From a paper:
Recognition of peptide-major histocompatibility complexes (pMHCs)5 by the clonally expressed αβ T-cell receptor (TCR) mediates T-cell immunity. Here, we solved the structure of the ILA1 TCR in complex with HLA-A*0201-ILAKFLHWL (A2-ILA) and several previously defined APLs. Combined with biophysical analysis, we demonstrate the molecular mechanism for antigen discrimination by the ILA1 TCR and model the mode of cross-reactivity with these APLs.
The overall conformations of A2-ILA3G8R, A2-ILA3G, and A2-ILA8R were virtually identical to A2-ILA with Lys-4, Leu-6, and Trp-8 pointing up and away from the MHC binding groove and Leu-2, Phe-5, His-7, and Leu-9 acting as primary and secondary anchors, indicating that a molecular mimicry mechanism underpins ILA1 TCR recognition of these APLs. This represents a likely mechanism for the stronger affinity, supported further by the observation that all of the other APLs that did not include Gly at position 3 were bound by ILA1 with weaker affinity compared with the ILA1-A2-ILA interaction.
Author numbering:
A (entry chain B): 0 to 99
B (entry chain A): 1 to 276
C (entry chain C): 1 to 9
């Protein structure tokens, strides 16, 4: 039995422009085992309608998943991704950066 | 040139509450086309690409019969492995399986695969000859002996060399327009001052397919990997992919660095520079 | 298309 902590990326589907509809993504990968909790946040609050790809895995057997939701970036709104996994003793929050 | 078809299966035990989670997923190349989830209401193999929707009811019935069978074998495999490794019922475990074939540009058979993993560690694998097995330890060797007597390798060879290929071609001809497309990455560069003495240059590749790609940095035309950062290639949610590569550099020396990008859609690779 | 596989570890 081995455990690999997830890598996390937060990003938009298309380059961001304030006031243009887009998609916010949280890609979690390289993790094991498969159970994982991922939320997208807006100003610290959980967004309820988020979709996700079907569970799949890489050559090393580690899993990956894509969570996503429609959004419209703005000057001051703050979006993030919060993740929990056996490997983490507390949820990890990754803020979205327009340029990573 | 080459193409692949790949099926992936994951079962997870749930000591508390009933049967294991089973999730199965099929790809050609980097495009998911099918899925099953033991927890979904439909209890059916579901399409996940437009071009597979054409296939008729017999197809979905056949595929559904078979994914269910696969999940049953996994259900029992979990029990079997708890026995082999002498583990308690407490605690959740994971069995994974993948199999598939590759073909070359001519679309002739190139290579086959079939492997299992237990709790994220290689358990047993069909060897490239498709005749023989690699078995990790005593437990896997038991399985190997069972499979040798049950002629499983023959069963797999017949699928991997024949059916797997014949259907891969069929798929590549339906939804030709999605699977045989190549979308060259759209590229650009950004600059950020890290400190008074240095800067990062980040090289972007966007909107590309398929996922294979290479981003490389040079200084005065010499390959550099010192002080570089790559990110794992990642899905935009729309069938395409993204990646960036960054390097930190002394400030004032940006002109000496170039980023080189290679992809199926760029027979002659691109190079990029910071335009001040 | 899936393999017609009834295989047990």
């Amino acid at each position: 039995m081995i455990q690999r902590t997830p890598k996390i990326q937060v990003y938009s589907r298309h380059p961001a422009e304030n006031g243009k509809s887009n998609f916010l993504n949280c890609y979690v990968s390289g993790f094991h085992p498969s159970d994982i909790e991922v939320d997208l946040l807006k100003n610290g609050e959980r967004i309820e309608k988020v979709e996700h790809s079907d569970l799949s895995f890489s050559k090393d057997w580690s899993f990956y998943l894509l969570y996503y939701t429609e959004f419209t970036p703005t000057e001051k709104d703050e979006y993030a991704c919060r993740v929990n996994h056996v490997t983490l003793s507390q949820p990890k929050i990754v803020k979205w950066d327009r340029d990573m | 040139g080459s193409h692949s078809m790949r099926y992936f299966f994951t079962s997870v035990s749930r000591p508390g509450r009933g049967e294991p989670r089973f999730i199965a997923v099929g790809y050609v190349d980097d495009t998911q086309f099918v899925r099953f989830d033991s927890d979904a209401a439909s209890q059916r193999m579901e399409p996940r690409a437009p071009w597979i929707e054409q296939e008729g009811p017999e197809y979905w019935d056949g595929e559904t019969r078979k994914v269910k069978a696969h999940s049953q074998t996994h259900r029992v495999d979990l029990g079997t492995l708890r026995g082999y490794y002498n583990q308690s019922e407490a605690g959740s475990h994971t069995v994974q399986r993948m199999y598939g074939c590759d073909v070359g540009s001519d679309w002739r058979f190139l290579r086959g695969y079939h492997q299992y993993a237990y709790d994220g560690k290689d358990y047993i694998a069909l060897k490239e000859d498709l005749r023989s097995w690699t078995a990790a330890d005593m437990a896997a060797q038991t399985t190997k002996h069972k499979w040798e007597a049950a002629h499983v390798a023959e069963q797999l060879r017949a699928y991997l060399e024949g059916t797997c290929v014949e259907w891969l071609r069929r798929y590549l001809e339906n939804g030709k327009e999605t699977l045989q497309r190549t979308d060259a990455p759209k590229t650009h560069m950004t600059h950020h001052a890290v400190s008074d003495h240095e800067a990062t240059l980040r090289c972007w590749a966007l909107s590309f397919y398929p996922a294979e790609i290479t981003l490389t940095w040079q200084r005065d035309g010499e390959d550099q990997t010192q002080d570089t950062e790559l990110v794992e290639t990642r899905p935009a949610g729309d069938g395409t992919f993204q990646k960036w590569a960054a390097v930190v550099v002394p400030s004032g020396q940006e002109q000496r660095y170039t980023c080189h990008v290679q992809h199926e859609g760029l027979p002659k690779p691109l190079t990029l520079r910071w335009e001040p | 298309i899936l393999g017609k596989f009834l295989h047990w570890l």
